[PDB]
């Protein structure tokens, strides 16, 4: 379980506005997850997420998330982006951020009028997967495969992050990445370590447009999907 932390998601707004009690419980399931880690539809997901015990879509601005962007960067910026994981249930993966760049589309997901249809909501996800940030773009970042794939298969592929190996002795899992602190991030489940990693923002210009942050399972079949709405200036 798990969301996007840093710049502040959604999700994160959601949970610290009152109204989101397990903010990293918002899932995609039942889907095929891996080894191709973009082939599951999003559903009702979409790609901010929803949350189906309190049943909070993140796709749609309310008062207390997606009305303004939450940090505003530079184009070409290599910035800090971070996710939560709870302590109960990281069981490695591979996860990702992407940027559409495309306004039209993402305009349909900054207007609290309006709730994006599951057609709308793949066509941002196709949008989102094109605008993929790849690890590799950070000069000097790491970017390896996981060591839940093999080389054919289509997860093999250091556009995206990999957790740590989930049978490592030493920081195994999601949680090895950084190797943090209990309660670094907030969990409600039982407690949150954070995930950190660069990427290197898009040449492009907006106001106010959505980072999207998908994490993947290899053992289960599920998705996590985030989202920030953030300013390229
Ligand atoms: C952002 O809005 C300001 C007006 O408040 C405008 O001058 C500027 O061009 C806009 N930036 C983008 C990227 O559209
Ligand atoms: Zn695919
Ligand atoms: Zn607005
Ligand atoms: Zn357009």
């Known amino acids: 379980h798990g969301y996007m ?5 959604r999700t994160r707004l959601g949970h610290e506005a009152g109204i989101d009690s397990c903010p990293e419980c918002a899932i995609l399931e039942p889907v ?15 790609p901010c997420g929803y949350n189906a015990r309190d049943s909070i879509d993140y796709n749609q601005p309310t008062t207390n998330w997606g009305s303004d962007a939450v940090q505003s960067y530079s184009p070409g910026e290599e910035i800090e982006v971070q996710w939560c994981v ?7 993966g591979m996860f990702t951020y992407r940027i559409c ?6 305009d349909k997901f900054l207007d609290p009028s309006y709730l994006p249809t599951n057609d709308e909501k793949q066509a941002a996800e196709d949008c989102f997967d094109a605008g993929l940030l790849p690890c590799t773009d950070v000069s000097g970042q790491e970017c390896g495969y996981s060591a839940d794939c093999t080389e054919g298969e289509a997860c093999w592929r250091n556009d995206w992050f990999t957790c740590n190996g989930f049978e490592a002795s030493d920081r195994p899992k999601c949680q090895g990445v950084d190797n943090a ?3 670094s991030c907030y969990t409600s489940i039982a407690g949150g370590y954070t995930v950190t990693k660069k990427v290197k923002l898009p040449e492009y210009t907006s106001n106010h447009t959505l980072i999207s942050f998908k994490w993947n399972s290899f053992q289960t079949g599920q998705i996590y999907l985030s989202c920030a709405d953030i300013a390229i200036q």
């Open 101 to 106: 760049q495309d306004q039209s589309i993402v």
């Open 181 to 183: 602190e209990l309660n």
């Open 86 to 92: 709870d302590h109960n249930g990281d069981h490695g």
């Open 5 to 9: 932390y840093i710049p502040s998601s």
């Open 32 to 46: 095929s997850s891996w080894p191709d880690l973009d082939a599951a539809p999003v559903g009702r997901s979409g």
